[PDB]
Design a protein around this ligand. Sequence first.
Ligand SMILES: Cc1ccc(C(N)=O)cn1
Ligand SMILES: O=C(O)CNC(=O)C(=O)O
Ligand code: NI
Ligand SMILES: [Zn+2]
Length: 331
Amino acid sequence: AQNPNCNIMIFHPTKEEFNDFDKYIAYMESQGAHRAGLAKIIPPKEWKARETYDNISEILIATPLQQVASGRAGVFTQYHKKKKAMTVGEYRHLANSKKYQTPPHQNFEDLERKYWKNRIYNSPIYGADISGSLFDENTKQWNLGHLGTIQDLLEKECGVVIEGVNTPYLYFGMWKTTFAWHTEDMDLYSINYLHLGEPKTWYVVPPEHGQRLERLARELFPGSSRGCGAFLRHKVALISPTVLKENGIPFNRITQEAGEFMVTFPYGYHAGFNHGFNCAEAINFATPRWIDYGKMASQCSCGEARVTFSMDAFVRILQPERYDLWKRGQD
Ligand SMILES: Cc1ccc(C(N)=O)cn1
Ligand SMILES: O=C(O)CNC(=O)C(=O)O
Ligand code: NI
Ligand SMILES: [Zn+2]
């Protein structure tokens, strides 16, 4: 078996290898990449996402989210307090202000130490889940707005015909902005391109060990667990690498820099944080190997987790028994 220790693999496709997205994902998996839950892909040197990022400042963040933490440094939840709209120009200025800017640090490891030591004592503002794309329309390779849709994958594999669409989202981050432990909706893949700015550090649990993380989460957040059998779907829980190590949870970490892609694989739990002002673009996608994961995916039915329009059809077709109770939570 390839990659039995479930290490995060890093790929360097040539421009020739970068033409066929599906084929390269399949290649990565032939090398065992999916066992880690996360892979890095460094684009060929000839490739560019867009010519320049001039005027990005005009983009509106309609609902910036202030990420307020509760708990202890290594085990906490965050809730999102909605703030007034601001442009990316205003957001960038805020990110770079004395109150919010990245502190002096020696290297990535020093900054990681500072993050887990001090995260809960601050409330950074995240510009998350903004529908849109920053890829040039003339970028033909790995353009996250030009991928085959999940609906077409389901149609090709299963012959089913469903409503729904599948578009990218933009994420504007600053120092300490955080994504909580989660898998994707319906345990889909995700792909994430860091367009510009400071790095993003990722933590990931191998899919074959995801239930170990769930078990620990139920122990660490017992009230949340009683409220919902799938509460990690709420995307509010953080657990530090130190606490994961103390509890024997297998995981890996890696830092993504501007110009790099990350792919998360079905049922690969991940969490992380931003180093400073940056902009990422991400979208969910599917492959034939995903279908079985979609069938098995656990759902939030307490009503907390956000349900996109398109997820309805996935649950309806892949999980018809769950559908009625699940939509009872959506509506
Ligand atoms: C605590 C918890 C959260 C989410 C899930 C899941 N399978 O989605 C399971 N257990
Ligand atoms: O970049 C972020 O803030 C969160 N991204 C993801 O969880 C992802 O790409 O799957
Ligand atoms: Ni994700
Ligand atoms: Zn729930």
